[PDB]
Ligand binder design. Sequence first.
Ligand SMILES: *[C@@H]1O[C@H](CO)[C@@H](O[C@@H]2O[C@H](CO)[C@@H](O)[C@H](O)[C@H]2NC(C)=O)[C@H](O)[C@H]1NC(C)=O
Ligand SMILES: *[C@@H]1O[C@H](CO)[C@@H](O[C@@H]2O[C@H](CO)[C@@H](O)[C@H](O)[C@H]2NC(C)=O)[C@H](O)[C@H]1NC(C)=O
Ligand SMILES: [Cu+2]
Ligand SMILES: [Cu+2]
Ligand SMILES: [Cu+2]
Ligand SMILES: [Cu+2]
Ligand code: NA
Length: 499
Amino acid sequence: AQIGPVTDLHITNANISPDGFSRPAVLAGGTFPGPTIAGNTGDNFQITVFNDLTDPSMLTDTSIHWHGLFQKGTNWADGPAFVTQCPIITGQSFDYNFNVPGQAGTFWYHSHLSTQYCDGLRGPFVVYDPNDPNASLYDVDDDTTIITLADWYHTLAQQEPIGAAITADATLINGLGRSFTNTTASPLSVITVQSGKRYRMRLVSISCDPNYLFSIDGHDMTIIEVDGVNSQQLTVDQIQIFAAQRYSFVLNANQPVGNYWIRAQPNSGGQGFDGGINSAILRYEGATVEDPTTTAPTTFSNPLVETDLHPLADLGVPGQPFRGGADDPLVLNLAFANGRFSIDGVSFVPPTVPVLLQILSGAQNAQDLLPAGSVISLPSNSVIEVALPAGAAGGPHPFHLHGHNFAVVQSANNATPNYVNPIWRDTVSIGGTGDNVTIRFTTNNPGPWFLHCHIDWHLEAGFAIVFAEDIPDTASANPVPQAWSDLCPAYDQAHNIST
Ligand SMILES: *[C@@H]1O[C@H](CO)[C@@H](O[C@@H]2O[C@H](CO)[C@@H](O)[C@H](O)[C@H]2NC(C)=O)[C@H](O)[C@H]1NC(C)=O
Ligand SMILES: *[C@@H]1O[C@H](CO)[C@@H](O[C@@H]2O[C@H](CO)[C@@H](O)[C@H](O)[C@H]2NC(C)=O)[C@H](O)[C@H]1NC(C)=O
Ligand SMILES: [Cu+2]
Ligand SMILES: [Cu+2]
Ligand SMILES: [Cu+2]
Ligand SMILES: [Cu+2]
Ligand code: NA
């Protein structure tokens, strides 16, 4: 069952074996992935998070981010530790009480403390639209049509070296899959469809690192949503999905009744499908209960290319149709050396006092804010352009902005910008050497918004900056509840920190 929009959510430690290998984890709702949190557009969500964690090897503090939800007027509920709150300590709870005006689509939630979401705290978050403009394109859209793609590690996250190339041990599809080494024939996930029906499959990358080449043997996929943004229909036979991205696609159950492989090939870790790694099963009602015998093609003739995507609505692009054609045009210098990432010469290390609390206490320019050099102010009611030229080791890096989606004016592997009708999204691959992926948005959401690579190991190694958007209006726009004001005193008392 789905939970929400008003619900408790307990965060616990437990042993799990999603690939046949037992390890302890950090779980929401007792499962991997966590339960789907769901509501309708414009609803009030009140997710009361109970921190019941006791195992220090995966951290006993926590904080949860609602990925892709704008949090307008509720910046304190966004979740990134030391940006918008101090962590919740064990034995305490915290009500994330916010609204979702003007958004409907496929989202997710995850820990936003250190690399803790890798240890298991990740689940889907769906905001349905009772008047969805795409409703007539499918018959079925429910918890059974959500498809999660996850990387899974046998080593606990707090034992992964900082700045290292860290590699997973299994790909999990809907929580199940097989290990790349010492492979055992552990259970594979089954997605069941009825011949003749059309399904809104909500594809969610809950990855901590790899991108996946996702396909379904014998089937094609008609994309209708990208990171919460409705798209024109685009039919493809393969989707390369980067960490934290989402797509909805229509699956037409139009092939013979049978079993078909679902494939998710990561860019690192195990390559291919031997022993049923990187796989799940699409089963038609009436098919024999047996593994598929289907083949992938040698090459995919209609792969997703990001520049083929266009919004369903007339969203356009803000600003002027040339590079630098914005009120505040930025170019970030994105680098890696010696185990640490940097942005504009500064490696991100979380501050002692969360950025939002520093601003509410009166710090009112970005040079007064800590960490020094890690906070850039943005002016209010202005068009922002951010160029993100690639080249830093460990790519391709999927960059994500909190508090906003953005027009993708230039995509990976294509030097031509699009000032007319590019897709809008919230997480974007910045590509490869020489690329100049560039995003635009307008500043109508006061508060500190994190910008970072969504490969969680890279974030931990410093690949982040904070956009302090409209510092002067942050306090008036974001009134804070007493429970939020209580978090830093409690956290610092528990950890013997003086501030
Ligand atoms: C990416 O595009 C940005 C502009 O959006 C380029 O920025 C210019 O960089 C040059 C020096 O490299 C400066 O003289 C300009 O002030 C910058 N802004 C402009 C021209 O609008 C950046 O060079 C591009 N990077 C790559 C690798 O192509
Ligand atoms: C590279 O990106 C550009 C810009 O998004 C793509 O150019 C568009 O191509 C479409 C489809 O043919 C035309 O309708 C648009 O007028 C083009 N826009 C511009 C500004 O040129 C181009 O197709 C992409 N390249 C590849 C190989 O897909
Ligand atoms: Cu996220
Ligand atoms: Cu986010
Ligand atoms: Cu990265
Ligand atoms: Cu984030
Ligand atoms: Na425009």
